[PDB]
Design a protein around this ligand. Structure first.
Ligand SMILES: c1cc(CC2CCOCC2)n2nc(Nc3ccc4c(NC5CCOCC5)n[nH]c4c3)nc2c1
Length: 273
């Protein structure tokens, strides 16, 4: 793929892992809030660099408030450093669709439209996601999605509308727009390209994009005018949207306002019927 404070006491962990990886691991558990318990997902560090990513990440989530954006609870220093987030019970979109091949097309339009609303709100909030991928969209129900995974995300300086990475740390290049690859500039619009790839994954029931290919070759294919083909079952109007998200010229590519609305209407055309 890749080429605030809390009483540790008020919090139980389970030997039930919700993904993991480089940093450490994510685990299930729950937190005693005001009256009740909240079921939670907790990102734990395997322990210097990691601990500032986590704080930047928490500080980003701290700032975001939207129904299609996963909610931070807070953080906790104990045997390890931990980020505590409200649990999306059904989990990753890609792994869901992989396991439930018979989820109806209308259902898929519903879920991607929701991501689009999440992203429309980020764009308006002047944050860039920088990891927008099926693997990081989480299902609360079959019919309710939230965006997760803000480990690479960034609040945009007030003078600029892009973030300039300096050093390519390990990057999900198959989701990255050409400007990210060439000029390391990441914007709302870059995330639109990622949304395009995310849409493609969704309608392919969670198949990996550009299968069989390296970022080397993907990057050659995109430069050669070439894009991924329409997935079995996808509606024409939706493959038109994917493609529009894959506009090479950042200037000419649609923003999240536009994408959100276009999806809104198509869903409502499908719903009404
Ligand atoms: C914030 C962060 C994360 C970790 C996320 C952050 C984004 O990257 C992935 C980790 N999660 N994970 C959840 N809920 C959840 C439920 C079940 C699974 C699950 N169950 C497997 C069972 C076997 O077949 C595959 C899925 N895997 N992950 C899951 C996550 N909710 C959240 C909220």
């Amino acid at each position: 793929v890749y080429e605030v404070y809390l009483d540790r006491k008020l919090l139980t962990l389970e030997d039930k892992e919700l993904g993991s990886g480089n940093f450490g691991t994510v685990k299930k558990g729950y937190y005693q809030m005001k009256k009740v318990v909240k079921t939670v997902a907790v990102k734990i560090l395997k322990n210097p660099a990691l601990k500032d990513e986590l704080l930047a990440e928490a500080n980003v989530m701290q700032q975001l408030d939207n129904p299609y954006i996963v909610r931070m609870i807070g953080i906790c220093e104990a045997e390890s450093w931990m980020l505590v987030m409200e649990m999306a019970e059904l989990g990753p979109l890609n792994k869901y669709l992989q396991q439930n091949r018979h989820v109806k097309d209308k259902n898929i339009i519903e879920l991607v439209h929701q991501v689009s609303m999440g992203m429309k709100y980020l764009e308006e909030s002047n944050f860039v996601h920088r990891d927008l991928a099926a693997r990081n969209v989480l299902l609360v129900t079959q019919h309710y999605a939230k965006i997760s995974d803000f480990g690479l995300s960034k609040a945009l300086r007030a003078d600029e509308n892009y973030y300039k990475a300096q050093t390519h740390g390990k990057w999900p290049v198959k989701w990255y727009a050409p400007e990210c690859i060439n000029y390391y500039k990441f914007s709302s619009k870059s995330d639109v390209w990622s949304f395009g790839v995310l849409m493609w994954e969704a309608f392919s029931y969670g198949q990996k994009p550009y299968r069989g290919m390296k970022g080397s070759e993907v990057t050659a294919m995109l430069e050669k005018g070439e894009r991924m083909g329409c997935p079995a079952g996808c509606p024409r109007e939706m493959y038109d949207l994917m493609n529009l998200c894959w506009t090479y010229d950042v200037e000419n590519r649609p923003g999240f306002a536009a994408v959100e609305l276009r999806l809104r209407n198509y869903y409502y055309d499908v719903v009404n019927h």
